[PDB]
Each structure stands twice: as C-alpha cells, then as structure tokens.
Amino acid sequence: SGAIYVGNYRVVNRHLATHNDWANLVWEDSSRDLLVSSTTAQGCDTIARCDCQTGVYYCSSRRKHYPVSFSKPSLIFVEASEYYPARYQSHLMLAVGHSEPGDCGGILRCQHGVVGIVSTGGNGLVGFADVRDLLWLDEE
Ligand SMILES: COc1ccc(C(F)(F)F)cc1CC(=O)N1CCS[C@@H](C(N)=O)C1
Ligand SMILES: [Zn+2]
Numbered sequence: 001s002g003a004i005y006v007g008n009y010r011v012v013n014r015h016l017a018t019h020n021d022w023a024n025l026v027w028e029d030s031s032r033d034l035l036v037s038s039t040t041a042q043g044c045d046t047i048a049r050c051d052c053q054t055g056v057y058y059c060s061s062r063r064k065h066y067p068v069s070f071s072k073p074s075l076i077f078v079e080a081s082e083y084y085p086a087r088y089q090s091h092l093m094l095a096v097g098h099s100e101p102g103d104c105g106g107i108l109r110c111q112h113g114v115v116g117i118v119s120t121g122g123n124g125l126v127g128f129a130d131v132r133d134l135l136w137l138d139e140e
Helices: 019-023
Strands: 004-006 009-013 025-029 034-038 054-059 064-069 074-078 087-096 107-110 113-122 125-130
Touching: 004 113, 009 113, 019 025, 019 034, 054 113, 054 125, 064 087, 087 113
Parallel strands: none
Antiparallel strands: 004 009, 009 034, 025 034, 054 064, 054 107, 074 087, 087 125, 107 113, 113 125
C-alpha cells in the first residue's frame, strides 16, 4: 500500500483505490495502473520534473529504502496477477530489486522529488508507474 500526497491530490495504484477514491475521482488510467483522487488537506510530497534513471524506493516487505537504477518509462508486457490479466502496461520503469504484491504504492524518488510508485514485480525485478509527465499534479 501507499500513496503520493501532492497539493490536493492523492495518487494511488488504480488496483488499490478505495470507494472514497472512486467517489472523489480526478483521473484514472488502467493501462498505467494509476488513479488520482481529491483531498481536503494539502500534501507535502513534491513531484520530480527530470530525466533521472537513479533513485531510491521504499520496499514495505523489507522495511527498507533501496537505491536503484531504473529504465526509462516504456510499454512493458506484465504477467497476469490477481488484479489484471497479462497485458502491456504503459509508462512503466523497471529495476532490479525486491518486491511482493503488497509493496505496491511505495515511493520511488530522486534528487528532484517523487518519480513514481511501485506497481509490478517478481523474480528480483520491481516496476514503477512513472508520474513525472503528469504536469497538472503541480496546479489546482
Ligand atoms: C508488486 O508486484 C509483485 C511483486 C512480486 C510478484 C511475484 F512475482 F513475486 F509474484 C508479483 C507482483 C504482483 C504484480 O506484479 N502486480 C500486483 C497487481 S497489479 C499488477 C500490474 N500493475 O499489472 C502488478
Ligand atoms: Zn530527478
């Protein structure tokens, strides 16, 4: 689990969105595994606006933050899970790192701010849904 809290937005994995998220929906995209809902309180996260390929992510199944090198956002074939059939996921970045299904939502960050959230995994790989192209997260 986990979310990004920027401005009056909450960014979560679409497959983990709650009823309150769907009832206060701003934007969702199943091909990216992302959903954004509106919040009453202002958040403290800032979004990175860069081309970094190195950063750090939070892994809840280890209680640890790990430094990683990650690929540029791309269209990647992801195997079937409990939440999606095997399909192509867009704007996904891959790295070598530990992940388990409940690690989705952990933040990936670089020197400029939040880059994305854990969305996929398996066999020593972790995939992150990028948010750096969503420029509207920075404005009301
Ligand atoms: C954090 O992800 C995992 C991590 C490890 C493994 C394992 F291979 F060990 F079974 C499997 C996963 C699950 C997975 O890839 N999912 C979770 C459901 S939503 C799906 C997607 N965004 O298409 C991504
Ligand atoms: Zn950066």
